[PDB]
Structures are given as C-alpha cells and as structure tokens.
C-alpha cells in the first residue's frame, strides 16, 4: 500500500538546511513551484502539437493557487504533463545530488537561498514555509499517485484513491504555524505580481468563502 | 538537398526587432545559448540514468566556447540531447509564437530585451551580435542536420556532410563586423563569470594560436 524511501544524504542535508536556517525572504518558494508547473505545462503542450490525443485527459493548460485557512494549506495545481510513479521515486536522484552539492558549495561561497532555482532543486524551497508537502500527480502513461514528505529524511509513495485529476500535478503545502500570511489573498497577489508576472499560462488565485 | 522555410510573421517580426533596435547590453546572448545548452545536457543525462546506451554517442557532457578571429565566428558546442530534423523544422511553432507575442507585449509595457529568456525565445538574442547563425545538430534518433538563418524571414534545413559530431548541438555565430569583442578571451571570460557562473556542466573557453 504505502512505500517509504530514504532521501540520499545530500538531499536530506539540503532539506534540513532549508526547513531550519534563519532566512526571512521565504516568499521565493511560490516562484519556484509556479516555474516547475510552467515547465510541466510546456511539456504537455509540446506533445499535444504532434498528438492531439495527449489532451484527452484535459484541454485546459493552467495554474491554480488554492488557499485553505481551515486546513492551513496552500495548494498549487497545474494541468501539466504530470509524473509517473517512476518520476516520483527517481525525482531525488543523480542530477538532484549534483545540483544540491553545487548549491551547498555556492551558499558556502556567499550565495543566497533565493538562488536555489539555478541548481534545479527549487522545489525544496517549499520547506521554507511548509512542515509537510503532499504531491498528487497523474501522467497519461500511469495511475494517480501521492508522494509525501515532512523532511525527516524519508518520503512515501502510494496509489491515490482521492478525487481523480485528469492529468497534472497538485502540490499541497501544509504550512508552518507562523507562515499563514501565504493564505492571504493580498499577500499571494503581491508575490505572483513580483516574481511570476511573465509566466505563459493563466494563474488563477482562488478566493475563499466566509467560514 | 536544401529545404527553405518561412518563419511565421511574429517570429520574423521578433528577429527584425532584435537584429536592428539600439540596445547596447548585447552580452546577454551568451547566457541564453549556454542556458539552452545546459537544458539539452540535462535532457540526455536524465535519459542516460535508465538507459546507459544513450551515451554510446558520447559520454562527456560539456559546453565548449570556440572563438575564431579568422572566420569571425563564435561557436557554442554542447554534447546535449541534440535535435532531430522535426525538432529543427518545428522549433519556431505555436509555443514560440505565444512566447514572442507575450515578449513583444512586455517590451511595449516597459520590459527590457535582457528579459527575452523568460518568454522561451532567448535563442533569438544571438541576432544582437550575429548576422547569420548556423546550427549543426545530431540526436541519437536521427542523422546530422544543418539549420541556418540570416534573419531575412526564412531559414534552411539540410543534411550535414561535415565532421560528424557524436551527439549534441553546435551554434555557429557569424558575428557582425562591429561585434568582434565577443572573440576576445578576456571578454568571454567576463561574460561567463557574470551570467553563467552556476551552470552545472563544465564550460571550456578555447584559446586561439597565433595566426
Ligand atoms: C512536485 N515537484 C517535486 C517532486 C516531488 C516528487 C517528485 O517531484 C515538482 O518539482 C513539480 C513537478 C512538476 C512536474 N510534473 N511533470 C513534470 O515534468 N514536472 C516537472 C517540472 C519541472 C521540474 C521537474 C519536474 F518533475 C510540476 O508540474 C510541479 C511541481 O512542483
Ligand atoms: C539551436 N537553438 C535554436 C534553434 C534553431 C533551430 C532549432 O533550434 C537552440 O535553442 C538550442 C537548442 C539546443 C537543444 N538541443 N536539444 C534540445 O532539446 N535543445 C533545446 C534546449 C533548450 C530549449 C530548446 C531546445 F531545443 C541546444 O543544445 C542549444 C541551443 O542553442
């Protein structure tokens, strides 16, 4: 049912550095997740040009930002190419390791945590604001899967029986107690305008009804 | 033998804007070409993880910068995944068109030409410094091809009978008469240090012997 995997030492060290170090400019996590979403959307759109059947699982190519004050979650949903089980399990591999080492070496040399995206490990900036990250994904060539990590040196992968998404990836950030500003409409709007103004797909910021 | 194609109106308009407008910060072309090279290198390295036979065409993953004062050419060579004939012919398609329109709209709104890479059309910044660009490419699944454009609204594609490269892409910039600074060792070293310091592959700047 649930498979548990250990992160390689370098990635676990990176996650520990991110989830703990004193760094106030945490807003940069959103640009990194939106950029990965945009890259996945480019991937499926390219495939759709020579094969219109690749969009049978959903024609719309977009990014949705869904805050939930009750659950204390910020969800980033995209209708990109998605990830197979193998993509989830092999996501933290050889290239992620080289990028982590280079990033760590850059930080020792005076670089800033906001430069994380230049090393291909931008996703891990999610741990600046989240105590746990759940990733639900669906690729045309595989079943729906849930990946999850609380940065304790391991991650889990299981088949997902939740609401079927047609195709794409949903990143659920279970926010840290002191990071609820990232659930506010004004705050999210400010960050998207500042760092993700030129993303080539519609970014819809959902609003919440009164509880 | 040689096939000639017209660029869509939007891309031809972009190339004309780049090859003509007054913009002094031309050095940004190198970061764009190196970034595309790094992306192609990531692509072949990922494939090599589950299939070591993908590297039969060459194990080394690197970027070489080769100035030639005699020919007035700056060549950017990479051993990335390369491009098939279809990749060369379809390179200026639907996504390139949307990115061009968004870029043009951003420029009208006060954006700078250095932001070109955010729209997925960074390659075209080559025309800030080059009067003509020749691209030799080899993908594992196809033969060696030469793509070429002098930004006159068309490009050519032909099979390439030159020195066989194992795999990857070679971008030959035929520099404009007043852009020979990009053939100088000190100048190229400065640009690579300023804009491409964190690229995850070795960048070798070749030096020239005395003529
Ligand atoms: C969810 N994660 C982190 C993680 C934990 C487990 C596996 O990945 C991400 O980085 C991430 C991945 C994709 C994705 N879907 N399809 C695909 O090619 N990508 C992809 C895109 C850009 C770099 C890498 C990618 F895979 C996405 O749409 C959003 C994301 O936030
Ligand atoms: C040579 N051109 C311009 C053009 C004219 C005709 C076709 O392309 C480039 O952009 C370009 C492309 C690659 C490449 N090889 N394989 C692959 O996937 N890419 C690729 C990488 C990043 C975005 C797009 C890409 F295709 C490269 O290694 C270097 C390059 O400078």
Numbering used by the authors:
A (entry chain A), B (entry chain A): 16 to 226
Paper quotes:
Besides, the shape of the binding pocket is changed in the helical conformation, causing a partial closure of the transient hydrophobic pocket and consequently, a more compact and rigid conformation. This behavior was observed for all other helix-binders, with the exception of compound 9, which suggests that the switch between the endo- and exothermic profile is largely driven by the conformational rearrangement of the protein due to the L107A mutation. Accordingly, the computed entropy of the complex in the helical conformation decreases, while that for the loop conformation increases, leading to a change in the thermodynamic profile of loop- and helix-binders upon mutation.
Here we report the investigation of the role of protein flexibility in the modulation of binding kinetics and equilibrium thermodynamics of drug binding to heat shock protein 90 (HSP90). It is a ubiquitous molecular chaperone intimately involved in a variety of pathways, including cell signaling, proliferation and survival, and protein folding. The unbound N-HSP90 has a highly flexible lid segment comprising residues 107–14137.
